[PDB]
Design a binder for this molecule. Structure first.
Ligand SMILES: [Cl-]
Ligand SMILES: [Cl-]
Ligand SMILES: [Mg+2]
Ligand SMILES: [Mg+2]
Ligand SMILES: [Mg+2]
Ligand SMILES: [Mg+2]
Ligand SMILES: [Mg+2]
Ligand SMILES: [Mg+2]
Ligand SMILES: [Mg+2]
Ligand SMILES: [Mg+2]
Ligand SMILES: [Mg+2]
Ligand SMILES: [Mg+2]
Ligand SMILES: [Mg+2]
Ligand SMILES: [Mg+2]
Ligand SMILES: [Mg+2]
Ligand code: NA
Ligand code: NA
Ligand code: NA
Ligand code: NA
Ligand code: NA
Ligand code: NA
Ligand code: NA
Ligand code: NA
Ligand code: NA
Ligand code: NA
Ligand code: NA
Ligand SMILES: [Sr+2]
Ligand SMILES: [Sr+2]
Ligand SMILES: [Sr+2]
Ligand SMILES: [Sr+2]
Ligand SMILES: [Sr+2]
Ligand SMILES: [Sr+2]
Ligand SMILES: [Sr+2]
Ligand SMILES: [Sr+2]
Ligand SMILES: [Sr+2]
Ligand SMILES: [Sr+2]
Ligand SMILES: [Sr+2]
Ligand SMILES: [Sr+2]
Ligand SMILES: [Sr+2]
Ligand SMILES: [Sr+2]
Ligand SMILES: [Sr+2]
Ligand SMILES: [Sr+2]
Ligand SMILES: [Sr+2]
Ligand SMILES: [Sr+2]
Ligand SMILES: [Sr+2]
Ligand SMILES: [Sr+2]
Ligand SMILES: [Sr+2]
Ligand SMILES: [Sr+2]
Ligand SMILES: [Sr+2]
Ligand SMILES: [Sr+2]
Ligand SMILES: [Sr+2]
Ligand SMILES: [Sr+2]
Ligand SMILES: [Sr+2]
Ligand SMILES: [Sr+2]
Ligand SMILES: [Sr+2]
Lengths: 82, 143, 56, 81, 46
RNA sequence: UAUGCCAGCUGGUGGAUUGCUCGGCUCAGGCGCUGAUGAAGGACGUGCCAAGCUGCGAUAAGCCAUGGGGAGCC
RNA sequence: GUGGAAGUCUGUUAGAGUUGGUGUCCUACAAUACCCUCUCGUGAUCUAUGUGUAGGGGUGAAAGGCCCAUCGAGUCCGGCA
RNA sequence: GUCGGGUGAGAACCCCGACGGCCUAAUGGAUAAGGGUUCCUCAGCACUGCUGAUCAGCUGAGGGUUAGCCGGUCCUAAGUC
RNA sequence: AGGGAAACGUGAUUCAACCUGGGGCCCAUGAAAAGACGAGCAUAGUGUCCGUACCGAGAACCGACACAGGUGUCCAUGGCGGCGAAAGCCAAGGCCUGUCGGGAGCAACCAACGUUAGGGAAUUCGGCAAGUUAGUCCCGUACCUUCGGAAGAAGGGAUGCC
RNA sequence: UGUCCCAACGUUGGGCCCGGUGAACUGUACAUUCCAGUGCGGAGUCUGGAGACACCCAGGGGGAAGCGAAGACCCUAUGGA
């Protein structure tokens, strides 16, 4: 478990009306990589979803501080806002 | 589990739009067993099924604006969209004025202040649009 | 407005219906005449030699 | 000579009408009137008919909802057949 | 629309004919309802 | 030696071919009117379970009589 | 001043229509469609349902227009191989 | 649309909640014509569904439309027999 | 009585529905019939027959289709807005089915579209396309004219908030 | 005033890659062609040369006198209306 800061600037590569969606993907990929786990094993607590969609589907925050834990037999991660 | 049928019965039992009924996430199993309307009323009392409140548009901002305008503000040239005759109906305004003048002349007559003949002369002039307002009529009467 | 597809949408009138006499859906409920058996037009049954080849 | 009553109409809805409203339901000849259904029912089960509602069904038949007087008991009547 | 009593009888019949060939007929004949109709895909008379 | 060409082998796809015939086609002989005593035709019903065909008509794949027939039948 | 006329004006009110883009589409969403622009919108107005007029005949403020994707003579079957 | 969860052999699109959205003469409510059981329930996914499907207007089976006072029914219109 | 967890209001303005009057128009005159009233009251009995589900549409209708087409009625008084049944935003209500998704800063090219210095129609058959102007108030308004009009001619100024 | 000088950058949906679904047009044969010539005078196929290792992706459409429609023009028929 540790607190990480995810930059979401790469969401700008996707059309503007869908930034929120791409953000949620970048977040999953970031954690999967930095916690050495499969993207399928990363669980995003709704708190994170609401943070990214706060200003609608087209206006994502530039970064997001997230608190994630890593454990269990298969190796998984659980993440949430802070 | 599929609770769409229960959503429909709930909307009817709670007498609300389906979009406002709320089903407790932790009781899909029990709601799923709810077959009858009575099964639904039962779950309603348990609080497992509830109705979200409906919203009403706030009129606070409207009220402040209403006050300013009633006080005569926020109606400068840059705030008007309709033609003058649309903002105030001229025939309607004349009806207001002419009735006000006739009521005035009528009170003065019963009051003895005006003789039926002076009343007539003034009445016919009012009908001919001689006086811009009541005050204008009174000012004239005072010679 | 085209005479084709757009003009097909206006068609919701009932004309030909099941005939009491012959059973075909040819009884014109407006004319009260069957275009198939002649019911409403004639006591005799509607028939014509041109309904088949001349020598048959 | 066609008969009036064809057979009892037995379904969940019929049973409720029987337990809660003292009503019996029958499949009847579609040429039968409410009155003819009342008489027939009284003469067949020796009961008193208070009201008869009818309906021509999408099965090509006529369904009748016969309410018996408080003097009679639908549940018991239908139970002897 | 407004269906008369007879129209209604005819519709009812059409609905009835729309049932399937009973299972036992299969065994008996040791092995289709050709008059299978659909309310949407087909069009009845009248 | 990939992509691939020609012919064949095993398996498929397809339903030709051969064989078969409960259906047709044509000829010949016989026979030949029905209906208000409601025909022909159609509709809707009718079966333990019955959708289609056939039969039948609320006595509804059937009722009665006489003769035939026969230990099976629905 | 009153009054409120008008095959009167503005108007994507409803509703009716369709000037241009020679735009989009053109094995289409569609055998006549889509978008913007545009015209009419108290009247010779628009519109629903019922009803009448039938093929050398209708109907036509006339374009040979329209009479069920069909018209300088409908459609079907027959004449007919 | 997204994040969680539910069911299931199987879930991007079946259901629950949250967050985010769309429709305001309509993408809401009641109905005429027309359709004809498409309605409701249960069980299903071979067929139908612009992908998938545990879902459905699909498949199988059951069930459902209750009137003195709502229509029809009565009257007559253009007009028809 | 009913209904509501509860309270279970009182006044006002503007007033669709509905009621009732006044005026004007016609080389146009705006149905008929059944029925009802006229013509009291009590009690009782009778009131049969047919329709009744559901869709009513960017999937239940017509268009071969779960078709961007076509298809009548009423909801024309929900809030802000404004002249408004206009735009835009928001309720009640409905929906995420104008039903395939995943990925590349996602190249060329195409459909829609935004912003372009200086020049300003040189482009083109042609200003086609795009743009310019714009609501409201005040001032002011030519030729011509059938005296109605032309006319919002033109041109000029103003416009928020407190 | 990006119509133009004279084009640039950007936005959304496609285009491109991946999963799933999954048609049609067209097809005498052969076919890697190019330059000339020849030929019923408008040749990928004949002749002479030249060039040419096979396969695949994307592209804009030069050619196949490309595909689509037994030329609507013109003439001819002891044709039609
Ligand atoms: Cl009705
Ligand atoms: Cl008055
Ligand atoms: Mg289910
Ligand atoms: Mg005036
Ligand atoms: Mg009834
Ligand atoms: Mg059924
Ligand atoms: Mg008409
Ligand atoms: Mg001409
Ligand atoms: Mg669709
Ligand atoms: Mg520039
Ligand atoms: Mg030039
Ligand atoms: Mg222009
Ligand atoms: Mg030719
Ligand atoms: Mg010619
Ligand atoms: Mg000639
Ligand atoms: Na029965
Ligand atoms: Na149909
Ligand atoms: Na004979
Ligand atoms: Na059968
Ligand atoms: Na005057
Ligand atoms: Na146009
Ligand atoms: Na003719
Ligand atoms: Na308002
Ligand atoms: Na889907
Ligand atoms: Na430009
Ligand atoms: Na080419
Ligand atoms: Sr026209
Ligand atoms: Sr159209
Ligand atoms: Sr119509
Ligand atoms: Sr006749
Ligand atoms: Sr004859
Ligand atoms: Sr049934
Ligand atoms: Sr259809
Ligand atoms: Sr006008
Ligand atoms: Sr106008
Ligand atoms: Sr043009
Ligand atoms: Sr344009
Ligand atoms: Sr076209
Ligand atoms: Sr007006
Ligand atoms: Sr035509
Ligand atoms: Sr012929
Ligand atoms: Sr399967
Ligand atoms: Sr359903
Ligand atoms: Sr008033
Ligand atoms: Sr209903
Ligand atoms: Sr509707
Ligand atoms: Sr529509
Ligand atoms: Sr809402
Ligand atoms: Sr789908
Ligand atoms: Sr800028
Ligand atoms: Sr020029
Ligand atoms: Sr020039
Ligand atoms: Sr100005
Ligand atoms: Sr050679
Ligand atoms: Sr290309």
């Amino acid at each position: 478990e540790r607190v990480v800061t995810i930059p979401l600037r790469d969401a700008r590569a996707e059309p503007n009306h869908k930034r929120a969606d791409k953000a949620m993907i970048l977040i999953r990929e970031h954690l999967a990589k930095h916690f050495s786990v499969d993207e399928d094993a990363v669980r995003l607590d709704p708190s994170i979803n609401e943070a990214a969609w706060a200003r609608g589907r087209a206006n994502t925050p530039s970064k997001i501080r997230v608190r994630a834990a890593r454990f269990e037999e298969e190796g998984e991660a659980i993440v949430e806002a802070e | 589990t599929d609770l769409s049928a229960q959503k429909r019965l709930a909307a009817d039992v709670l007498d609300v739009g389906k979009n406002r009924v709320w089903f407790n996430p932790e009781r899909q199993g029990d709601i799923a067993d709810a077959i009858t309307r009575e099964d639904v009323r039962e779950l309603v009392d348990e609080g497992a099924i509830q109705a979200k409140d409906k919203k009403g548009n706030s009129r606070g901002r409207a009220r402040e604006r209403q006050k300013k305008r009633a006080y005569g503000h926020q109606k400068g040239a840059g705030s008007r969209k309709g033609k003058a005759g649309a903002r105030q109906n001229s025939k309607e305004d004349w009806e207001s004025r002419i009735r006000a003048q006739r009521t005035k002349l009528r009170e003065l007559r019963d009051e003895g202040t005006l003789s039926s003949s002076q009343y007539r002369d003034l009445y016919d002039k009012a009908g001919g649009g001689e006086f811009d307002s009541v005050a204008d009529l009174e000012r004239y009467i005072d010679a | 407005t085209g005479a084709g597809t757009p003009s097909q949408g206006k068609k919701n009138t009932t004309t030909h219906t099941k005939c009491r006499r012959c059973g075909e859906k040819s009884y014109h409920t407006k004319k009260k005449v069957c275009s198939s058996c002649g019911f409403g037009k004639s006591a005799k049954r509607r028939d014509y030699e041109w309904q088949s080849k001349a020598g048959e | 000579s066609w008969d009036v009553i064809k057979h009892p109409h037995v379904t969940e809805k019929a049973m409720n009408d029987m337990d809660f409203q003292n009503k019996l339901q029958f499949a009847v000849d579609d040429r039968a009137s409410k009155g003819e259904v009342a008489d027939a029912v009284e003469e067949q089960y020796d009961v008193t008919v208070e009201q008869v509602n009818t309906q021509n069904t999408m099965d090509g038949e006529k369904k009748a909802v016969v309410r018996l007087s408080e003097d009679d008991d639908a549940q018991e009547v239908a139970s002897r057949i | 629309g407004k269906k008369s009593k007879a129209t209604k009888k005819r519709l009812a019949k059409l609905d009835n004919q729309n049932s399937r060939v009973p299972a036992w007929v299969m065994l008996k004949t040791d092995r289709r309802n050709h008059k299978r109709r659909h309310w949407r895909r087909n069009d009845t008379d009248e």
